[PDB]
A paper describes a structure:
The MCD monomer contains an N-terminal helical domain involved in oligomerization and a C-terminal catalytic domain. Unexpectedly, the MCD catalytic domain is structurally homologous to those of the GCN5-related N-acetyltransferase superfamily, especially the curacin A polyketide synthase catalytic module, with a conserved His-Ser/Thr dyad important for catalysis.
Like HsMCD, the RpMCD and AvMCD tetramers are also dimer of dimers. The central cavity of RpMCD tetramer also contains a helical segment (αA′) from the N terminus of two of the monomers. For RpMCD, residues 55–58 in the other monomer of the dimer, in the loop linking the first two helices of the N-terminal domain, approach within ∼10 Å of the expected position of the adenosine group in the active site. The 3′ phosphate group on the ribose of CoA is recognized by Arg387 in CurA (equivalent to Asn421 in HsMCD). This residue is equivalent to Arg387 in RpMCD, which may have a similar function.
Residue numbers in the entry:
A (entry chain C): 10 to 31, 37 to 450
B (entry chain D): 39 to 451
C (entry chain A): 8 to 29, 37 to 451
D (entry chain B): 39 to 449
Write the structure that this text describes.
């Protein structure tokens, strides 16, 4: 039945209210010592006790002691090499069930149990996420921790099940402890104090939502900023216009997604499903059924640095001197001003930009642009390419000002998605694809 | 409907799917088809799960050759991934179908049911346990008072899963949660909606019972909550068969008493009136004594009076059986151990596990036909004290040390 | 966040008031004496204690003692006649604001303050409803209690504000304690234990709703039974036939109200708004958008009584020699069991029914038939007359088997309601309006 | 916009309306009209309310004749009906409009405020109070904890409505809600969504303070919940101007302490550190007495010190104002009364009415500029006990017996 919606609501409410209810720096060595103790503990009370302790000791430790520990999760808490070999020989001797099971057992690094146990401490999950954040930041100077992050991903993928994710409008009636977080995760608009915030949430032509999961109480995991309007924008400058006149909800037909952000560093790479946006769309449709179309005014981070690599190679598959000439006009502080040099680049940029999307592919079989991977993964369609839609000194170096417009269509959202994942079809508008 | 072959095929498809919407659709269809399948087609699919769906050997082999060549971290990590039965990914995916968790839990009931006739299915069961252990986290287990204001669909489930003192109909039911001197609680998990994973039936009283009949019988009169001083756990039921062997934590009862205490601060003594679903099965196996420091010559003597249609009403041939049986029960608890070195009896494992103390042995505390089949009407009282729960649990788990009252550690031969 | 926010909020507060909401025999004289203490009391703690005491006493009192007390409310607890006259003379002397203020104070009987205070006892409102049920049951044999009932209505009206009325679907996920009460309030269907209720609610083509108000926690005031179908019926027998084959709710296109009941005798005559069915329709629609037509299959209690009066009237407005002659058929064992007698009657009856519905008014000016006053007031349209829709011995004595369908169109509910209340215009279909003389 | 006359016209159309749907439509349209209209039109409508909307004389007289011609119960009940001012039906109708109760509460504020300048409005007030008493039934009042996880639009209101120790910004607010040594409760009623009618600010401690400075101070060390034995009610506010004079019960505090203890059973002593707004105008009117036993020559002199601007910052002239004031405060309390046998202090009538007993007169407990303004920096304590609350309440209401402490009586 559908009663499942109420049951989970009631349940997640007991969980959150419960959460809102509930020390001296340690060295890298002690932390390791403590881990071993926790891994051999049998009692459940002493277990959470050692766990909470370890987590407090780590949060308190000096940046150096922290790294000593993370490194140890690589060297001292991987699988037992002896056992694993024994187990390998057995399988090699007879590919039996007994042997194929002990192999699965012996190949599991001890870290997994350690993380599974640390997670029993009150606040454990939140601390664990902050820990994966530290290892993610340590991969560079210590590639070894890439395997330590692998195990966090495994476990996290299991905890943050997409079935328990939930969408909530983040308006002025939202709990203060949560909004206080929004002040921090706010990407676009500026917000220093609660006044800036209320003001930010005030306008009736502005909206924003958040996805919450019971594993992290009162934590908006994904933040979705929307703008209500009648026209489908091609420039960001206007939507963020502080002195412009805002309209009314019934006075809109096109909801435009100007910002979508993952708020927790430690959750990078953890999928929360691919029909997120679809949900944010229905919420808007249920509230304001007038809204006929749903488009996004997303950026294109990676295009500029793609135009670099693609130009630096004088043996481009489709980029001659005729182009490379006027092309490098971008190599000037201010070029977007000269209305002349502007209309010159438009055709050439939009032409290479179209390639960057439908043509360019990253490592694995998938679009190079990260924002494309997302919105496209979410069944949207690469509808329009707004040249110079963001002339901010930020976007100018990010994508040379180039901004695009993905369009979500309730009808064929799932359709595009299957296309993209099963085959490779990059749902794009005809007007953009004819720039090969 | 669908045949084992067709299910096996659709499984394969689901496993190689890459689109979410299409994946969930395939998962919802396979589950739907499995349910419609036949006892033969079903055993076919559960079996194809124990053979075709184990770890992929081709990929396991490469991973091993790679590790042998270079035992690098990447190689070790690769070996783990490839050592995973395909079953696990299959199970994880069906779980995305709506009602999958429930469906999945019913499927595990099905393998746990066939395991005896098909010991290979046991390898499939291990993987459900691995996932289930991760899905049913104790952190989301929620205690919820269950009374007459509780939805009917849920109450209906309690009459069906009540496993200690059978609840005949809705009147017996109302009888157990409507009186102000009666209390019921249940633990719920977001993984299974409206499904009380574990529910406890307590009786608010002034004394520590020794027989259920008095608690059950629809005759006696209640008593205001503020009047009682003692809470008595007279029934504990683990509802989902497919959830057998998944620990929900050892401090479950500690929560039910913390609840009862904040509500009725007038209740300061907590005990249980529990069964012993493994005593008749023990004593009988012990009656074919090849050589035991327990039973002797003048032993089986009174142990015959147990084999009657009702030896529990004639003080004659029974009063002679009380001190022999209790002497032996004291042996069944403090000495008899299960294959894992834990206390032989399931219910003593639960309560001792929750920090309770074996406080008293009640000879013939339950006369019902069920009580007779389990331990010859034998029942015991475990005691719970918030101040000792943690210690007893820790002491039991860390050192295998059982917590029993002196008045019982003595009755051991 | 104001239409949905106020609902979030109200739902919440109500949930609190729900869990929060989840005695010796006295003589009429003692109860009356007590009412006097309570009335003069000043402390809140003792007020409640006394009131709680009086209610318990009343409950346990003898039927004679209850009755004496109710009568006491009429003669002893009315307005103080002395000061009332004093105030009348003050105002006749000079109609000042202070004069009409005191007059208003002077006219209010002590019954009101007594009821208001008894309402503070826990379980007070429920007890007062039960008590009002008693005075309602005694107005015949005791016409003086009518002025006691008038005071109850003034307070109940203010307490049971339509704004807090909430609609809830009633099914197997509904709390047992509420379902238990439902097993007693069930109208059409027959229900014994829980197997009946569970059975009666199981079918996917059946759906009943309830209206709840925070004043009477866990209590369904108005119970609405509906049937999911693919056509607007003309006879109940089929709908109620257990040996019928249900249909998936998604397959249905029609929603048919076939039972609407007020569950609290003591609430009789208290309005909960005219847009009740509106809410039930908007609800079904959002759950099953696959339903376009909203129609009822109502009874016409009081048609038989009316027809009798029309016949016994030697000067009947529209009963010629023929009609009178044919009608005599209605006065036989099972005339309905003769296709010929039936088809002969159908034209004359249906035509009389039309004048009944469209012309027969009440002692005020409202449509005489109580079920029509309801559905018409709920903005419905009288859509069709179903000759011989219910041949159950009951329906036969009620309206000679005559049933009807009222048509609810979620686009003219307000229009029709306004017409009936503002202009007195009945919303009937031509098929029936062009059937009147 | 809309003129007072067009409003009075609408009201008349609403009173005779029979249709429900159009009934609430006109009601919404009147509320909105009144709401956004010049002050002058407003006073028009409100004065019309006292004038053109009292009872209908015709009907009232007809009803009078009948009663004089036949004092029957049916004639009586009919008189009562006709004595009701049309205003009531007007209000009752406007209240069906979406958001009417809130609009109506605001309108009462409009009249209440204009009374002093226009006493004929007091009559309008009278029917507002009649209806509000009925509507704001105490049984639907709900106690709710108000911490940092509370909806913003509500916390905002808590800020805006503080009336004991002003809150300046959200951080300052966060301060009274987040710190574990702190707590806050509000009372909500279904008639006004998200509107905290009454809200209390308690400072969990382990003693019984006599000054606010050490409570509201940002620089302070927190204390765990269980690390407290007491509870200190330092601020209590009644939020709705328009709900002035409507009782929400007399056991509001008994509910809060019952909640604090069920959570922190480590608290076994609940006391307040309340102000005394009725001390300013009392002593300021006191020294204008033709005669006053509580004010002699030897007193009215050592009391002259308070006249200076800043005398609270000198250990010197201050210890003479300690015994003379306490004896007048202890008098003002146990003695002084208002137009009724009830205590003159609006805060004492609240706490005593709530079952508390005057336990101490913490001299100069408030240094705030507003504090001196009223109680001259003086503060008092009130002791609540889950044993005497009901007993004290009764004594005060049944017999006017002011439960106080010996330490305070003699003075
Ligand atoms: Mg795993
Ligand atoms: Mg009145």
């Amino acid at each position: 039945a559908d009663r499942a919606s109420e049951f989970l609501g009631g349940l997640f409410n007991s969980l959150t209210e419960r959460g809102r209810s509930l020390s001296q720096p340690m060295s890298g060595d002690e932390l390791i010592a403590l881990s071993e103790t926790l891994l051999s503990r049998r009692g459940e009370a002493s277990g959470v006790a050692l766990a909470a302790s370890l987590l407090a000791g780590y949060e308190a430790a000096d940046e150096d002691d922290k790294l000593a520990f993370l490194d140890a999760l690589a060297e001292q808490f991987g699988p037992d090499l002896a056992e694993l070999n024994t187990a390998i020989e057995a399988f090699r001797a007879d590919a039996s069930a007994e042997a194929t099971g002990e192999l699965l057992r012996a190949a599991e690094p001890r870290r997994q149990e350690l993380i599974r146990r640390l997670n029993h401490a009150p606040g454990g999950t939140a601390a664990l996420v902050k820990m994966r954040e530290a290892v993610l930041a340590r991969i560079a100077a210590h590639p070894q921790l890439r395997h330590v992050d692998d195990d966090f991903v495994h476990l996290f993928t299991s905890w943050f099940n997409r079935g328990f994710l939930v969408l909530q409008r983040i308006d002025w009636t939202t709990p203060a402890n949560i909004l206080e977080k929004i002040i921090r995760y706010e990407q676009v608009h500026t917000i220093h104090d609660w006044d800036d915030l209320r003001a930010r949430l005030a306008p009736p032509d502005r909206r924003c939502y958040g996805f919450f999961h019971p594993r992290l109480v009162d934590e908006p995991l994904i933040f979705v900023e929307v703008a209500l309007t009648k026209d489908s924008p091609a420039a960001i400058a206007p939507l963020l216009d502080l002195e412009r006149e805002p309209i009314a909800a019934s006075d809109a037909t096109t909801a435009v997604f100007y910002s979508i952000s993952n708020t927790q560093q430690g959750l990078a790479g953890i999928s929360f499903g691919n029909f997120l946006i679809k949900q944010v769309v229905e919420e808007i449709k249920r509230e304001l059924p007038n809204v006929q179309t749903f488009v996004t005014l997303s950026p294109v981070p990676g295009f500029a640095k793609w135009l670099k690599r693609e130009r630096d190679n004088p043996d481009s598959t489709l980029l001659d001197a005729s182009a490379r000439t006027a092309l490098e006009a971008l190599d000037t502080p201010n070029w977007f001003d000269d209305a002349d040099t502007a209309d010159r680049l438009k055709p050439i940029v939009l032409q290479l930009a179209a390639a960057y999307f439908l043509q360019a592919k990253g490592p694995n079989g998938r679009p190079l642009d990260p924002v494309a991977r997302f919105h496209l993964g979410n069944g949207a369609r690469l509808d329009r390419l707004n040249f110079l839609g963001d002339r901010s000194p930020n976007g100018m170096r990010q994508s040379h000002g180039l901004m695009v417009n993905y369009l979500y269509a309730l009808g064929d959202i799932e359709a595009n998605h299957e296309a993209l994942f099963e085959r490779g079809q990059i749902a794009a508008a005809s007007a953009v694809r004819k720039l090969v």
